[PDB]
């Protein structure tokens, strides 16, 4: 409760018990001092110009905010391991949130060199967003969470909020929201904060693959005791017109009568990683399948779950339907195909589309003597009753949950980017160096302070959230696919720091290992 | 309020194609204003004489039924403040 | 599709009718139905009373809101009210979406 | 309760009790059908076009209202003598108001002789406003109450009110009410209505007058220890000037110090009953004293209460300052000054200004050695510390009560008609006879039925207030003024029918007849 | 006369000083007031709670009230909220007298 | 909306008064409208040559300095929409 004496121990275990897994994870953050303390609203017209499709329209607060919604945040790749080749599914349950360990320091450039002094007598300011009455910035796969590795100090992100605009300008009903308006928590180099949060009871991440497909689903020895149109005419003459039906079974699996059929589809525009396999023109933005609000185009990116590919084709993957991450000391502008990490969402092949194939066939007029069989393709293919279709994976880098917009209806709404979507998701956890004026002029002055002192923060940051798991009890004979660390020599051990000290990811890992059938 | 003028912004500056591929492309959409871009105007200058001319809206520009030739089109924005800027296009069509 | 509250089971349908009343059958009988009633209606009064849920705003919202306001400016008829020949008129379609709420 | 047994006895009494009186009273009502139950708007512009100082806007609702609000609905003439010969003061105490032996007549016109019928199972809907949530129209002295003489019928008044206008124009805040959003009660022919209602703690009417002045207040033989300055010149040359300063005692009661001084004034124009000593001019609105309100001007009429005229002069009567009644069949336009009955407030001449003369003078300069002591007159007086003053007198045919507008501040709200201002006065009893559709089309119409059956409503109406009363004890030696019948032969005995059966009360009564020192 | 509450009482004055520090006193005895002070100036939070009692609207109106709204038309900064600078600005008075109650 | 014309009515149309009293006044504040009077116009006709014309807005009029003469005062009133009615006020002075 003093200046020497430790507000928090450093806790970064993961234990494991009989159906859930307690992931315990610690960091130190730095938090610097945002805005100059300012509110400031932020537009395309403030970054100098953007166009229809990126305009915008917010604000942005001089608050932090902690966003542990990366599941490196929690598991090392060895926990990722043990999940994902045991269990055939997972959720989380509850979270505990620390914040303890707080020292806020003072910077003076006075001379022209720095020095770096401590303040004691100076607070940060930390409240958490409990009611959910602030624009919620998490899930929508942002940087500055807790980083991978332990080892390493993070700098919290600055909390900024987008609202209506008509161009860069506010509509009257775009809100303005100051956080000074919520009961903060004021904490001393003594001081600490923790708060409690119970998961929704969101269902388990289908952490499995399948072993069946949904077309193949069926006895391959016994036919089926229903008829399908086989011929429609018995022969090669001119008015030769019959209806021969045969009986639907192994013989012909593609026509017999199912019960179910494939998940909802959107299509993509596919692009090879073989950069000649592809068209010479630029199609990045053109070609891309996008969705309209309010007039201003928007990329999918990624959209409904839909597999990558087909079997054997390993290069194509969608414009846009599928996640890419960046591997270590990758650039943020146009890097070459070999920087990033594409997910591959072929393991959902067996009920999903191909999302860079058509959904199927339609009929598209009414057959006579006349007119022949004309049938059209279904680019687009929304919800229909019977449809089964499963999620998008979870990485280990990937997003955790995400917040399901108020609205008056949805469908399914399990995030488009994977995780698991709640109408109450972890609140916003908003942290701010609270302002400390330099020197107020001795005679009055209406105006507000703007001369602050110069300071930041820092300190440590401990998560614990307890995930419930879903055994697998599976009567299959043959070893199933597990992740395995491959065994042959190389220079650097992969998931682990090379001699520079940076810890490096060296490829996304899912969940879809173990294999169900459906 | 004192806005500055928009920028018309095509992606391909120099679009090739040959003559068994016509239907091509050119992106307008990726032209930048302080406020927002009211209308995107397409007009061709060197376009030779053909079935028709172009004097599309759309910010992204869909072209078809081209034939051999050179092909000079230019796109204006208009801000929603009336301030304009015309940027050019071009396009050439092999044998 | 049109707005409102899908149930399956909604306010039951309250059916009304004049009971008939014949005129005069004859003096002898008839197996006909009888054709001949007397002209008559009725009339009285109906009352309906719905006890509305309300879900009450908390937001954190700063600035204010967009809200239904009838507009002061002189007027030859106050609005939603009966004008001269008291017939009484609706000048608009008022919805509810006038509050804000994030997604 | 049933339409053959009668749901009301006829009460009429007044019983004197120790220190209340319990007038009761009963009347028989006739109650149209109003604009045809609709609701109209009603302006200047409806009714051909008014100036800007009687341009109005408001609407004219269905509906009836009992307006007991006059003094003479309870009070007997001999009654009004009891209460004002023998108490120095009253105030009301409760009511209770009933609504009885209802019947509803349906007439037919159908052959050109009219028919009327009874329509036993037709309704009338009667309301109080007891939350007052409506434009309070009692307390504007209006007609329509209930007539002074028990025997006549009387047809009750239409309820419509005015609201915010620009001219005859609505603006924005301009509220329009629907009398049928309150919840009314349905009375057929074997129902009655009845609520009691508790008076405010409003004071006692000053039933008397004052037998002593405000500046005759001091004895009369022995003189003050204060002095006054007599002389400022000690001779008549030219540079003689002193300061004599003589004890102010009987011989020169005027200058000498008082307490307290008249109540506040507001100027009226003195127009005299002999047309010869008025001008020659129309100084009728020019000359009147008016108060401006968004613009456009409205007579005084009567404003505060003020003498109506110095000793002696009982011709002349303030422009605007006195309450006009009118006689027995007197029309309502332009009628002769012998038909129309002038209430004289003299008897408060003794602490109030006379409302035809300016309240004072006041010194308007510094006089000094080279101007000489300039002063000017004081038309009207506002509110001053020490300010004694005396209410309107309350006559027999004058207004009881009026509701104190809802505002954040007023002073002395007794109402300038005379009467007991009262923040939550007497509800406003709303009445409508519910409409009855004549025949609807067999074949159905979504507008609004207009064609109705014509009928109307009777009935009786038991008012019964309980007024309390201050008795007189007084050890004044010789006998007071007391209102009394004058014994002389007369065609018609006063206060009573003549020939024709129609009633006439002859003479405003007042009531300050016993005096009372101040 | 500026409007708000006349208190006999109202709220008291919360009057907050630096204690002053001296400098250096000399090593010698001198009798007249220390003038040499440290300068040095105070900061800290305060926080103030004010409990309002408010007076529900039951009125028996029918049409629209006149109410205070944020006019909706795109603008450069929303008002009532800091712009590009974050310098909140008031951008006009706002009075209480919107509601209608008859006299 | 399909306003009516505004009337003009002078109380006083035919004002007499001697020399001793000049101070006289003619009221047009009773003058209507279907809406309301936004103007009210006081303007001589007949007026003899004196220190001063007229030419006063107030809707009643208050006179002074009056020599003998005979004098006439058109009132010209003006709707909210702009229709106006003029009518005419006299006064007679003498010696």
């Given at each position: ?34 805005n ?21 329209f ?69 409240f ?30 600055q ?28 904490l ?37 005791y ?35 059929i ?36 928007s ?86 009753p ?39 998701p ?58 395995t ?10 998931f ?10 060296p490829?996304?890992?899912g969940?879809?290992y ?5 | ?95």
């Amino acid at each position: 409760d003093g200046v020497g004496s430790s507000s928090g121990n450093w806790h970064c275990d993961s234990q494991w018990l009989g159906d859930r897994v307690i992931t315990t994870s610690t960091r130190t953050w730095a938090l610097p001092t945002y805005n100059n303390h300012l509110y400031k609203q932020i537009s395309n017209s403030t970054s100098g110009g953007s166009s229809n499709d990126n305009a915008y329209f917010g604000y942005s607060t001089p608050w932090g905010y902690f966003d542990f919604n990366r599941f490196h945040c929690h598991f090392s790749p060895r926990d990722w391991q043990r999940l994902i080749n045991n269990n055939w599914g997972f959720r989380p349950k509850r979270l505990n949130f620390k914040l303890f360990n707080i020292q806020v320091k003072e910077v003076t450039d006075n001379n022209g060199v720095k020095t770096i002094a401590n303040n004691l007598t100076s607070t940060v300011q930390v409240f958490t967003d409990s009611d959910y009455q602030l624009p919620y910035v998490l899930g929508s796969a942002h940087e500055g969470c807790l980083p991978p590795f332990p080892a390493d100090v993070f700098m919290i992100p600055q909390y900024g909020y987008l609202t209506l605009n008509d161009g860069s300008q506010a509509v009257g009903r775009s809100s303005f929201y100051c956080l000074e308006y919520f009961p903060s928590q004021m904490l001393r180099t003594g001081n600490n904060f923790q708060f409690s949060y119970e998961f929704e009871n969101v269902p388990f991440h289908s952490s499995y693959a399948h072993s069946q497909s949904l077309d193949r689903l069926m006895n391959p020895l016994i036919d089926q005791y229903l008829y399908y149109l086989s011929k429609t005419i018995n022969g090669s003459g001119q008015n030769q017109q019959t209806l021969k039906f045969s009986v639907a079974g192994p013989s012909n699996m593609a026509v017999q009568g199912r019960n179910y059929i494939p998940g909802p589809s959107y299509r993509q525009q596919r692009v090879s990683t073989t950069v000649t396999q592809n068209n010479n023109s630029e199609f990045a933005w053109p070609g891309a399948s996008s969705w309209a609000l309010n007039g201003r185009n928007s990329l999918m990116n990624p959209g409904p779950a839909m597999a990558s590919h087909k079997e054997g084709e390993d290069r194509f993957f969608p414009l846009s339907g599928s996640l890419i991450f960046g591997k270590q000391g990758t650039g943020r502008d146009n890097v070459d195909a070999d920087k990033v990490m594409i997910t591959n969402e072929e393991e959902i092949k067996t009920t999903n589309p191909v999302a860079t194939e058509s959904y199927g066939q339609v009929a598209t007029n009414h057959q006579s003597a006349q007119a022949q069989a004309q049938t059209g393709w279904v680019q687009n293919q929304g919800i229909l009753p019977g449809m089964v279709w499963q999620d998008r994976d979870v990485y280990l880098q990937g997003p955790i949950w995400a917040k399901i917009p108020h609205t008056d209806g949805n469908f399914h709404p399990s995030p488009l980017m994977g995780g698991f979507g709640m109408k109450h998701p972890p609140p916003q956890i908003l942290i701010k160096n609270t302002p400390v004026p330099a020197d107020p002029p001795t005679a009055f002055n209406k105006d507000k302070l703007n001369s602050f002192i110069t300071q930041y923060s820092t300190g440590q940051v401990s998560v614990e959230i307890e995930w419930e798991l879903q055994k697998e009890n599976s009567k299959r004979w043959n070893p199933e696919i597990q992740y395995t660390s491959n065994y042959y020599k190389s220079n650097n051990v992969e998931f682990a720091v090379n001699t520079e000290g940076v810890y490096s990811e060296p490829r996304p890992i899912g969940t879809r290992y173990l294999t169900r059938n459906l | 309020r004192k806005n500055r003028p928009p920028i018309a912004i095509v992606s391909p500056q120099f679009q090739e194609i040959s003559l068994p591929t016509t239907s091509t492309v050119i992106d307008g959409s990726q032209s930048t204003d302080d406020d927002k871009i009211v209308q995107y105007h397409w007009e061709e200058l060197k376009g030779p004489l053909r079935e028709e001319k172009i004097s599309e809206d759309t910010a992204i520009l869909k072209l078809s039924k081209l034939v051999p030739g050179n092909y000079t089109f230019s796109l204006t924005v208009v801000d929603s403040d009336g301030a304009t800027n015309s940027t050019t296009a071009n396009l050439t069509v092999n044998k």
